[PDB]
Design an enzyme around this catalytic site. Structure first.
Site, PDB file in Angstrom:
ATOM      1  CG  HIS A 112      -2.157  -0.936   0.909  1.00 56.10           C
ATOM      2  ND1 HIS A 112      -2.214  -2.178   1.477  1.00 56.10           N
ATOM      3  CD2 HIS A 112      -3.276  -0.798   0.146  1.00 56.10           C
ATOM      4  CE1 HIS A 112      -3.320  -2.781   1.092  1.00 56.10           C
ATOM      5  NE2 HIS A 112      -4.006  -1.951   0.291  1.00 56.10           N
ATOM      6  CG  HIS A 132      -1.690   0.220  -4.403  1.00 56.22           C
ATOM      7  ND1 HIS A 132      -2.275  -0.830  -5.084  1.00 56.22           N
ATOM      8  CD2 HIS A 132      -2.686   0.829  -3.731  1.00 56.22           C
ATOM      9  CE1 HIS A 132      -3.580  -0.869  -4.802  1.00 56.22           C
ATOM     10  NE2 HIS A 132      -3.852   0.136  -3.971  1.00 56.22           N
ATOM     11  CG  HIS A 185      -6.868   4.333  -3.850  1.00 56.61           C
ATOM     12  ND1 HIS A 185      -5.780   4.368  -4.662  1.00 56.61           N
ATOM     13  CD2 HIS A 185      -6.993   3.064  -3.434  1.00 56.61           C
ATOM     14  CE1 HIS A 185      -5.218   3.161  -4.694  1.00 56.61           C
ATOM     15  NE2 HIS A 185      -5.957   2.333  -3.959  1.00 56.61           N
ATOM     16  CG  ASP A 186      -4.767   2.428  -0.601  1.00 51.82           C
ATOM     17  OD1 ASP A 186      -5.818   2.347   0.089  1.00 51.82           O
ATOM     18  OD2 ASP A 186      -4.338   1.514  -1.304  1.00 51.82           O
ATOM     19  CG  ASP A 214      -7.923  -0.852  -4.563  1.00 52.29           C
ATOM     20  OD1 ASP A 214      -6.719  -0.539  -4.547  1.00 52.29           O
ATOM     21  OD2 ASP A 214      -8.580  -1.134  -3.586  1.00 52.29           O
ATOM     22  CD  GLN A 227      -3.318 -14.901  -4.700  1.00 52.91           C
ATOM     23  OE1 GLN A 227      -3.602 -14.106  -5.612  1.00 52.91           O
ATOM     24  NE2 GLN A 227      -3.355 -14.557  -3.429  1.00 52.91           N
TER      25      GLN A 227
HETATM   26  C1  IHL Z   1      -9.049 -14.930   0.485  1.00 55.30           C
HETATM   27  N1  IHL Z   1      -7.670 -15.390   0.656  1.00 55.30           N
HETATM   28  N2  IHL Z   1      -7.221 -16.392   1.446  1.00 55.30           N
HETATM   29  C2  IHL Z   1      -5.879 -16.463   1.285  1.00 55.30           C
HETATM   30  N3  IHL Z   1      -5.045 -17.398   1.947  1.00 55.30           N
HETATM   31  C3  IHL Z   1      -3.679 -17.782   1.856  1.00 55.30           C
HETATM   32  C4  IHL Z   1      -3.578 -19.116   2.504  1.00 55.30           C
HETATM   33  C5  IHL Z   1      -4.739 -19.152   3.454  1.00 55.30           C
HETATM   34  C6  IHL Z   1      -5.781 -18.264   2.825  1.00 55.30           C
HETATM   35  N4  IHL Z   1      -5.463 -15.519   0.408  1.00 55.30           N
HETATM   36  C7  IHL Z   1      -6.588 -14.841   0.052  1.00 55.30           C
HETATM   37  C8  IHL Z   1      -6.659 -13.686  -0.882  1.00 55.30           C
HETATM   38  C9  IHL Z   1      -5.821 -12.590  -0.311  1.00 55.30           C
HETATM   39  C10 IHL Z   1      -5.508 -11.714  -1.499  1.00 55.30           C
HETATM   40  N5  IHL Z   1      -4.734 -12.087  -2.617  1.00 55.30           N
HETATM   41  C11 IHL Z   1      -4.716 -11.005  -3.473  1.00 55.30           C
HETATM   42  C12 IHL Z   1      -4.049 -10.779  -4.819  1.00 55.30           C
HETATM   43  C13 IHL Z   1      -4.221  -9.490  -5.465  1.00 55.30           C
HETATM   44  C14 IHL Z   1      -5.008  -8.460  -4.821  1.00 55.30           C
HETATM   45  C15 IHL Z   1      -5.244  -7.138  -5.427  1.00 55.30           C
HETATM   46  F1  IHL Z   1      -4.098  -6.605  -5.895  1.00 55.30           F
HETATM   47  F2  IHL Z   1      -6.105  -7.326  -6.425  1.00 55.30           F
HETATM   48  F3  IHL Z   1      -5.853  -6.399  -4.492  1.00 55.30           F
HETATM   49  C16 IHL Z   1      -5.638  -8.678  -3.535  1.00 55.30           C
HETATM   50  N6  IHL Z   1      -5.463  -9.978  -2.879  1.00 55.30           N
HETATM   51  N7  IHL Z   1      -5.978 -10.454  -1.678  1.00 55.30           N
HETATM   52 MG    MG Z   2      -7.366   1.041   0.373  1.00 61.34          MG
HETATM   53 ZN    ZN Z   3      -5.667   0.472  -2.874  1.00 63.38          ZN
END
Ligand code: IHL
Ligand code: MG
Ligand code: ZN
Length: 313
Positions: free
Chosen positions: A68, A72, A106-107, A217, A269
């Site tokens: 962040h 970004h 935005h951040d 975002d 993911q």
């Molecule tokens: C729901 N969940 N559970 C896990 N785990 C790991 C092992 C246990 C669970 N990982 C997640 C997702 C987290 C995430 N990945 C990304 C990639 C890109 C972006 C963005 F750039 F688009 F914003 C945001 N995120 N947010």
């Molecule tokens: Mg934000």
């Molecule tokens: Zn953001």
């Protein structure tokens, strides 16, 4: 007045594409942003001296956290630039002006912690702003920087134009709170399908700009696989530091923030691409067909994460 910003040839061509990566040369990112405002808005949108002073005060109010950060901010602004340039005639002069600024800001002053962590730590910001805690803060920092001397890049707007743009920025920045996105996309889904969606309806515009903000975002999932994959490392570096802090407050973090679940990242993911990203770029592509390259790029990265799970990398 007769002063263009121009980029080297490879950047001049690739910046127009949704999958553009702004690169590792931090000193080129202001010029990239200015280049995008000038082509998206015009060389007359902002007094150049005020714009440069505003960009440098914004940069200075982003912190050196793994994800962040200033990179970004400029990345989210470049996605927005690509959406606006591929949908030339759908947006007012004020919207063009406002939305690139909203994305850069935005951040503002993010600390690498979720709203949830602020509420559990009992951070003063969580008493000042009960919901969308960080996002009300980001808009608050935007207004502060705008009110610094020589920083009012909207100086030439009428009183009522000024208030409309700050209101576009406020709602755009609030919309980046992913807790709000799910309901917003659901409504947009329904309005588009029943054919009630109406871009003259201001509350409909708002929803549509909201979804654009979510799309910009999340644009890390729409880049070339090596960019997507390495950004995931910065993303988890923040989430796992938050997980550590949760454990310090005596709380089991959610699995997404528990570095002890490194192994499950590929499967985390998938959930994220299926639960959030794909639905987001789908509904966006329905509403704004020339944004389809974001959907296509997102599906290619999902299929790359499936390859990782199958051990094919
Ligand atoms: C729901 N969940 N559970 C896990 N785990 C790991 C092992 C246990 C669970 N990982 C997640 C997702 C987290 C995430 N990945 C990304 C990639 C890109 C972006 C963005 F750039 F688009 F914003 C945001 N995120 N947010
Ligand atoms: Mg934000
Ligand atoms: Zn953001």
């Amino acid at each position: 007045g007769l002063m263009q910003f121009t980029l080297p040839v490879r950047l001049c061509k690739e910046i127009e594409l949704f999958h553009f990566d702004i690169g590792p040369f931090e000193n080129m990112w202001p010029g990239i942003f200015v280049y995008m405002v000038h082509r998206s808005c015009g060389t007359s949108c902002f007094e150049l001296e005020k714009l440069c002073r505003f960009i440098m005060s914004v940069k200075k109010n982003y912190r050196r956290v793994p994800y962040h950060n200033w990179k970004h901010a400029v990345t989210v602004a470049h996605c927005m630039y690509a959406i606006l340039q591929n949908n030339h005639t759908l947006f007012t002069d004020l919207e063009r002006k406002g939305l690139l600024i909203a994305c850069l800001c935005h951040d503002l002053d993010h600390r690498g912690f979720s709203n949830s962590y602020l509420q559990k730590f009992d951070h003063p910001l969580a008493a000042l702003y009960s919901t969308s805690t960080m996002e009300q803060h980001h808009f608050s920092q935007t207004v502060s920087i705008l009110q610094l001397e020589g920083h009012n890049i909207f100086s030439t707007l009428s009183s009522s134009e000024y208030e409309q743009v700050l209101e576009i920025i406020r709602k755009a920045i609030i919309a980046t709170d992913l807790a709000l996105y799910f309901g917003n996309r659901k409504q947009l889904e329904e309005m588009y399908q029943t054919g009630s969606l109406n871009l003259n309806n201001q509350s409909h515009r708002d929803r549509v700009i909201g979804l654009m903000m979510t799309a910009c975002d999340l644009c890390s999932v729409t880049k070339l696989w090596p960019v997507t994959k390495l950004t995931a490392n910065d993303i988890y570096a923040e989430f796992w530091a938050e997980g550590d802090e949760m454990k310090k407050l005596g709380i089991q973090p959610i699995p997404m923030m528990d570095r002890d679940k490194k192994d499950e990242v590929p499967q985390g993911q998938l959930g994220f691409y299926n639960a959030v990203a794909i639905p987001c770029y789908t509904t966006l592509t329905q509403i704004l067909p020339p944004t389809e390259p974001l959907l296509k790029a997102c599906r290619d990265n999902l299929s790359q994460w499936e390859k990782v799970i199958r051990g094919e990398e």
